[PDB]
Amino acid sequence: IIGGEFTTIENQPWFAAIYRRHRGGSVTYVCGGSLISPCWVISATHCFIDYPKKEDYIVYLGRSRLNSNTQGEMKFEVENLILHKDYSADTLAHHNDIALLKIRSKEGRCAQPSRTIQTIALPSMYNDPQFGTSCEITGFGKEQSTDYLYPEQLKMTVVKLISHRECQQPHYYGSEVTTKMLCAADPQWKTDSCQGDSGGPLVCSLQGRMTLTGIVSWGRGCALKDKPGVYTRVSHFLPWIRSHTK
Ligand SMILES: COC(=O)Nc1cccc2ccc(C(=N)N)cc12
């Protein structure tokens, strides 16, 4: 997250921190995710496509820091790694950038809701917020495009949804951004999601309900003028989510 504010997991309790175990035992941060039901975390296929082995992943819930075992946090392994069959990546655009991770503790249990671990509601069909709506993003992603390290403390920011017609403008993304993708950015281009924030939530309050409207997917640079953050539009994927969580 470029700009914005440092936060804690109690403010973003649906946030899942996803890591990968390498040969030799080193563990590195991969992507963010969102808890949609006790056994299920939703993220982006691009985070996993190159290492599609469920055994490699570690998922934390209730974790506020990149290298601290936050009081009340829960550690999980991945029982099922479901990637979208029609996923693909162009130079910029990522297609069907959605993945499901069925989580399980070493004891075989799913998440136990608490003050720091909570689910996030899915949107309803054909009901996304109007353009101009303010939504929040959360992640352990880069604080500056030129950084190589990720921030130790969890960050959040607020961005505004951008219409498909605006995002398809020539100086924006043209025909590279599709109706299955949602654009969002800061009108002043000072704050945004960045590399490392992928798979994380774009949460919008709609009709008084906090909803998982998007999943961080892609973007040209970070907080770059006329280059919004591009998010998987969760409402389009409701039949796929329902079918793959059954
Ligand atoms: C410096 O360019 C990047 O690091 N871009 C990005 C790489 C990987 C994922 C990204 C996701 C969102 C964005 C964005 N601009 N919001 C940018 C991303």
UniProtKB/Swiss-Prot annotation:
<feature type="active site" description="Charge relay system">
    <location>
        <position position="198"/>
    </location>
</feature>
<feature type="disulfide bond">
    <location>
        <begin position="39"/>
        <end position="110"/>
    </location>
</feature>
<feature type="disulfide bond">
    <location>
        <begin position="135"/>
        <end position="204"/>
    </location>
</feature>
<feature type="disulfide bond">
    <location>
        <begin position="31"/>
        <end position="47"/>
    </location>
</feature>
<feature type="modified residue" description="Phosphoserine">
    <location>
        <position position="145"/>
    </location>
</feature>
<protein>
    <recommendedName>
        <fullName>Urokinase-type plasminogen activator chain B</fullName>
    </recommendedName>
</protein>
<feature type="domain" description="Peptidase S1">
    <location>
        <begin position="1"/>
        <end position="246"/>
    </location>
</feature>
<feature type="disulfide bond">
    <location>
        <begin position="167"/>
        <end position="183"/>
    </location>
</feature>
<feature type="active site" description="Charge relay system">
    <location>
        <position position="97"/>
    </location>
</feature>
<feature type="active site" description="Charge relay system">
    <location>
        <position position="46"/>
    </location>
</feature>
<feature type="glycosylation site" description="N-linked (GlcNAc...) asparagine">
    <location>
        <position position="144"/>
    </location>
</feature>
<feature type="disulfide bond">
    <location>
        <begin position="194"/>
        <end position="222"/>
    </location>
</feature>
